[PDB]
Amino acid sequence: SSFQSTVDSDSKEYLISDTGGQQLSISDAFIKESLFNRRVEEKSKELPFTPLGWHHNNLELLREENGEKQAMERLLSANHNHMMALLQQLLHSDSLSSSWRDIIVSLVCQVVQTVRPDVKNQDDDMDIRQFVHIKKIPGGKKFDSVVVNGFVCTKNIAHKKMSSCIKNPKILLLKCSIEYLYREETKFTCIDPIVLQEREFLKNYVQRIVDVRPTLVLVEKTVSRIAQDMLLEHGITLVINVKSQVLERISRMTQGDLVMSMDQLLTKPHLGTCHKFYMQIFQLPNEQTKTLMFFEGCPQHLGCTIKLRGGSDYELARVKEILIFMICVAYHSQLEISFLMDEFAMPPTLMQNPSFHSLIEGRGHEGAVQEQYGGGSIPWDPDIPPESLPCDDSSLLELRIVFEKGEQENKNLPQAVASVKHQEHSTTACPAGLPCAFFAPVPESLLPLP
Amino acid sequence: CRLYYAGEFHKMREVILDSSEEDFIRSLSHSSPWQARGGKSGAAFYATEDDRFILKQMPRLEVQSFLDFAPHYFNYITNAVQQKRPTALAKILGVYRIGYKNSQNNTEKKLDLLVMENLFYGRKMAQVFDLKGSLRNRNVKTDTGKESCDVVLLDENLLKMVRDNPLYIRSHSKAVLRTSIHSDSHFLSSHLIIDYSLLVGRDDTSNELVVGIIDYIRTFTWDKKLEMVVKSTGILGGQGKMPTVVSPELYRTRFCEAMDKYFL
């Protein structure tokens, strides 16, 4: 219908509800996935209840979730398209960042080339649009920007006499406090010996701290400055009212956990790590002249941020606008590891990436032996691209099978030329909000069929 | 003959209908109306020659009900009805009572009739549906369908036959319909009216859909139309229950919700 018409941009209750829902998790065409999910949840819905009372929940929508993981990862593997470059050089317009964004774009590309996460599972994760901030200082004239692969704040050390600059720091991060915490028997009497019990809390914790040997010490919750003394005398520097966001952020970038009742951690894996904390000072009136702390070599390199400048407000935020134009083109180009050969020339071997990979390897179950048996029935849904384009001109099962054979030279059928072409230059292919269209379905789909 | 609330109807005709009085008269008066077999009844069902207007026969109770609702109905009209803001609700052109001693009519007998627009038009309707939205019961028509002619398909039939019901209405249009549905059902709910269904007519190709709420006059009647005939068995379905049935407010929500699925 309008979903087989999917070599072009030119376009179940709960299902389509969630359809719109994730459709503005990321914006794209509704009907394509409406109809795909229609058909495939139709076979599903035929599984569970009215007849056949199947065990319809485990091990099959499991298989779809796996299908969608492979979908994201591999379909983002096949760009050869005469990519945006012309589109983007054309995107140049719309503001006064002339002559001096190019660094910006080249090096945002660098940092977003830093990124190929494989974090949560057997999954090449991509937390794109989630994992960095860049920042300026309004002052002077802009063009002096200098990048650093790490954080830089204005969050002064817990004690200006603590580390003027730290290196290879391990730290201990806990959403809770260094202050005698909520023991079962809530009791408060004899102020002095109970502040002393707080002192002992602090100090045996400090035993266990230096047993961990942090380098910086940071709580989300609180501390008693007693412990602050206990470690600044040890030299384990400290930070204050410490922001939970980058806490979890970099603790995860580290190996440092946040073991929350360290009576738990009789051992290490709570300690974080990074490379070095280093200040830099400014000196002039008009209190832009501040001091700000480099925090570099964080245990994950998938993160950067820059010294930027500017002598105004409105053109500066307008350069921010170019920077978010770059935000958008970045993650757009990113859903593909930036395009795919259109006119069903990459997509045959794409839908078949499962096919030929898990066939030649075999080593094939990654789909399934039902992707052998049931893989004749439904992954045929991934086999829609051909069922869209070829059967119009050339070949229904034929290029499908003989091109999951693995030529690796992916020109394909000439619907509208009879000889050679691809929609790429024909400028006729739905842009790439459409990919995520396959990874949202099963999480929301496995419950409504209880 | 007796005409009820001549002034109000006249206003209704022009207002919502924007129907010229002369046109109205011509349709009814000029050519004899053609009869349509109605339901099992017993009550006459007619249509004008032009098929623009439908003349139905109503019971004394229903006619009285009409009078009670007329002020609200009128108000609803002003806020929104066909010329005003289009309402799915039936457009009542006129209500009359004919009882004539003369031989043609039964003597000392009262025949009450309601004239209204006809949702389908004269031209043609390929498929028809009567959607209650109610939980399974008479959600199918056995005898109907017998006619090679247009069958009045019911909810279950819509669900199975015109399953994955193809009614695709534009997104812009969906919003307008649903909004109007919500208001109508709310209006009906206020009145305690129930057991009304949505009549749907379909044209094929770039399709044209015809829809409107019908079976408006029936309210507060717990005891009515006891079921007849034997129920088919072999399948779980309607229960011996329920002494406790769905209320008017409940009916309204279900109606809209069900209708929501019908059009995409």
Swiss-Prot record, chain B:
Consequence of changing residue 56 to E: Loss of autophosphorylation. Loss of phosphatidylinositol 3-phosphate 5-kinase activity
Region (Catalytic): 21-264
UniProt-reported outcome of changing residue 232 to A: No effect on phosphatidylinositol 3-phosphate 5-kinase activity
Post-translational modifications: Autophosphorylates which inhibits its own phosphatidylinositol 3-phosphate 5-kinase activity, stimulates FIG4 lipid phosphatase activity and down-regulates lipid product formation.
Residue positions where Phosphoserine is found in the record: 148, 232
PIPK domain segment(s): 1-263
Subcellular location: Endosome membrane; Early endosome membrane; Cytoplasmic vesicle, Phagosome membrane; Late endosome membrane
The protein's assembly and partners: Component of the PI(3,5)P2 regulatory complex/PAS complex, at least composed of PIKFYVE, FIG4 and VAC14. VAC14 nucleates the assembly of the complex and serves as a scaffold by pentamerizing into a star-shaped structure, which can bind a single copy each of PIKFYVE and FIG4 and coordinates their activities. Interacts (via chaperonin-like domain) with RABEPK; the interaction recruits RABEPK to the endosomal membrane. Interacts with SPAG9. Interacts with EGFR.
Pathological condition linked to this protein in its record: Corneal dystrophy, fleck: A form of stromal corneal dystrophy characterized by numerous small white flecks scattered in all levels of the stroma, with configurations varying from semicircular to wreath-like, curvilinear, or punctate. Although CFD may occasionally cause mild photophobia, patients are typically asymptomatic and have normal vision.
Written domain comment of the UniProt record: Interaction of FYVE-type domain with phosphatidylinositol 3-phosphate (PtdIns(3)P) is necessary for targeting to the membranes of the late endocytic pathway.
Protein task: Dual specificity kinase implicated in myriad essential cellular processes such as maintenance of endomembrane homeostasis, and endocytic-vacuolar pathway, lysosomal trafficking, nuclear transport, stress- or hormone-induced signaling and cell cycle progression. The PI(3,5)P2 regulatory complex regulates both the synthesis and turnover of phosphatidylinositol 3,5-bisphosphate (PtdIns(3,5)P2). Sole enzyme to catalyze the phosphorylation of phosphatidylinositol 3-phosphate on the fifth hydroxyl of the myo-inositol ring, to form (PtdIns(3,5)P2). (Microbial infection) Required for cell entry of coronaviruses SARS-CoV and SARS-CoV-2, as well as human coronavirus EMC (HCoV-EMC) by endocytosis.
Protein name: 1-phosphatidylinositol 3-phosphate 5-kinase
Organism per entry: Homo sapiens (Human)
Gene: PIKFYVE
Residues of the whole record sequence present: 1822 to 2085 of 2098
